[PDB]
A paper describes a structure:
Fn3-3 and Fn3-11 are found in the non-repetitive region of A-band titin near the tip of the thick filament, Fn3-20 is in the second D-zone super-repeat and Fn3-49, Fn3-56, Fn3-85 and Fn3-90 are located in the 1st, 2nd, 6th and 7th C-zone super-repeats, respectively. Mutation of Arg27839 to glutamine would result in the loss of the salt bridge with Asp27804 but may still be able to form hydrogen bonds with Asp27804 and Tyr27813, depending on its conformation. We also characterised the effects of three further rare missense variants found in patients with HCM: Fn3-11 Ala16872Pro renders its domain unfolded (contrary to the predicted domain structure) but is still solubly expressed in bacteria, whilst Fn3-85 Ser27083Pro and Fn3-90 Arg27839Gln do not affect the folding of their domain but reduce its thermal stability. Although Fn3-85 Ser27083Pro and Fn3-90 Arg27839Gln have melting temperatures above physiological temperatures (47.0 °C and 46.8 °C, respectively) their unfolding curves show a proportion of protein unfolds below 37 °C, which may point to these mutations playing a role in disease. Gly27849Val in Fn3-90 was co-inherited in trans with an A-band truncating variant. Mutation to valine at this buried position introduces a large sidechain facing toward the N-terminal PXXP motif crucial for correct Fn3 domain folding. The disruption of this motif is likely what renders Fn3-90 Gly27849Val insoluble when expressed in bacteria, and unable to be refolded. The predicted structures of the three variant domains suggest they can in principle fold correctly, with a slight clash between Val27849 and Ser27766 in Fn3-90 Gly27849Val the only steric hindrance observed, but calculation of the change in Gibbs free energy due to the mutations suggests all three destabilise their domain.
Encoded by the gene TTN, titin spans half a sarcomere (the basic contractile unit of muscle) and has various functions including preventing sarcomere over-extension (Gautel and Djinović-Carugo, 2016), acting as a molecular ruler for thick filament formation and as a hub for numerous signalling molecules (Kruger and Linke, 2011, Linke and Hamdani, 2014). Fn3 domains are only found in the A-band region of titin, where they are arranged with Ig domains in a pattern termed super-repeats, which themselves are repeated. Fn3 domains have a characteristic beta sandwich fold, with a core of hydrophobic residues as the “filling” between two beta sheets that pack against each other face-to-face.
Author numbering: 2 to 102
């Protein structure tokens, strides 16, 4: 059916620093019609409407988002992609505040 992938599994915030966040995830349970080729990582400030893509070419299952706004709260999304399209996102349930510990 040439389906796209399902959502990445168990998206985890691995690290939260002053203005960066490291995410990790497990591959989707459904690759669809073809193998996973790349992951798309996105951010959204709690005060913005639209998600901003950080990278569309993440090939590992972990990624560090940098140059965030210290003191700002964010949602993050990771989407899985195969040759046939982009799947549904895995998203952080709570917003993450980046700040110096």
């Amino acid at each position: 059916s040439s389906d796209s992938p399902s959502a990445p599994v168990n998206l985890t915030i691995r690290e939260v620093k002053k203005d960066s966040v490291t995410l990790s995830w497990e591959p989707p349970l459904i690759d669809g019609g073809a193998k996973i080729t790349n992951y798309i990582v996105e951010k959204r400030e709690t005060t913005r409407k639209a998600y901003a893509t950080i990278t569309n070419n993440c090939t590992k299952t972990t990624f560090r988002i940098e140059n965030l706004q210290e003191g700002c709260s964010y949602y993050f999304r990771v989407l899985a992609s195969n040759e046939y399209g982009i799947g549904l996102p895995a998203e952080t349930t709570e917003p993450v505040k980046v700040s110096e510990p």
